[PDB]
């Protein structure tokens, strides 16, 4: 109902408004077995991330709920998740030729957190490493988030 207006036009404000149960809502109004689905909910929520304590907590909790459930469902294929994820972030080209998200600071800040979590399948690390560490990829500079991510990834 109202969660649908947040997903159409992600916003840090609209996010806070969903209330203390955004964790449960996102997990419910989302098909956590379809890789393409989860990727969309991930990127969207991830584009709302920000340093503000209020928001930061909300976004990372929602993601934890979303991905924890996703990576748990046997039917869910993490490789497709990653692959499609790299796709939407415009790191990995595709056949459908999907139009990549505008900014990448949000997903990269969330990915560092995500990757540090247990629910994250460690065999995905290197694939992600290779594209986040791809020197000529969409990533064009000395990102701050990029360094932490990368550091965490090699550390794995």
């Amino acid at each position: 109902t109202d969660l649908s207006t947040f997903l159409s036009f992600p916003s840090p404000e609209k996010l806070l408004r969903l209330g203390p149960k955004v964790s449960v809502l996102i997990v419910q109004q989302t098909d956590t077995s379809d890789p393409e689905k989860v990727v969309s909910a991930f990127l969207k929520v991830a584009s709302v991330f920000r340093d503000d304590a209020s928001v930061k907590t909300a976004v990372l909790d929602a993601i934890d709920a979303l991905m924890k459930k996703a990576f748990s469902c046997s039917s869910f294929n993490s490789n497709t998740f990653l692959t499609r994820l790299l796709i939407h972030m415009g790191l990995l080209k595709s056949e459908d030729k999907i139009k990549a998200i505008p900014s990448l600071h949000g997903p990269l800040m969330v990915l560092n957190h995500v990757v540090r979590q247990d629910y994250f399948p460690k065999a995905l690390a290197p694939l992600l490493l290779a594209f986040v560490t791809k020197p000529n990829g969409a990533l064009e500079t000395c990102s701050f988030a990029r360094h932490n991510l990368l550091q965490t990834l090699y550390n794995i």
Binding site: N79, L86, L92, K93, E95, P126, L127, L129, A130, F131
Partner: protein, 159 residues
């Protein structure tokens, strides 16, 4: 919307290929459920370039042509998909000459296409991958990579 010109070059292409095609290579028009030929959908095979770790493997790919051909290049898809940095998980091959908006020409003949794809196997364009697995292994552990390729060639060797 105008396949009359297509079925025409596909017919002289079918001929040219027969008078002289590369060794071990295969390229033949599939058969329609009725029994008649179909110069639109082709079943091919490329044997690993000798000396490379692809050596001895028979790699089958499908060649689908649009009603645009030769204005447009065909869609070459490996059946099944192959472990290779420039091959999509779907099987589709990502080569510069198979993109109408790029190095593709109506002059390009099947023999030229299958050969270009044979070359692409040993010499991949890692600058722009179409698959994550092959790419990751290629950059991080280039030796494990070759091992994977050899095991894949063997798996596709004529049994």
């Amino acid at each position: 919307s105008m396949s009359g010109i297509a079925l025409s070059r596909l017919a002289q292409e079918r001929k040219a290929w027969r008078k002289d095609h590369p060794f071990g290579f295969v390229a033949v028009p599939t058969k329609n459920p009725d029994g008649t030929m179909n110069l639109m959908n082709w079943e091919c095979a490329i044997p690993g370039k000798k000396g490379t770790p692809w050596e001895g493997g028979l790699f089958k790919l499908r060649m689908l042509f649009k009603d645009d051909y030769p204005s447009s290049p065909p869609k070459c898809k490996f059946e099944p998909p192959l472990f290779h940095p420039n091959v999509y998980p779907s099987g589709t091959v990502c080569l510069s000459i198979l993109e109408e908006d790029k190095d593709w020409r109506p002059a390009i003949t099947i023999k030229q296409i299958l050969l270009g794809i044979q070359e692409l196997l040993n010499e991949p364009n890692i600058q722009d991958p179409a698959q994550a697995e092959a790419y990751t292994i290629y950059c991080q552990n280039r030796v494990e990579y070759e091992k994977r390729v050899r095991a894949q060639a063997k798996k596709f060797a004529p049994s």
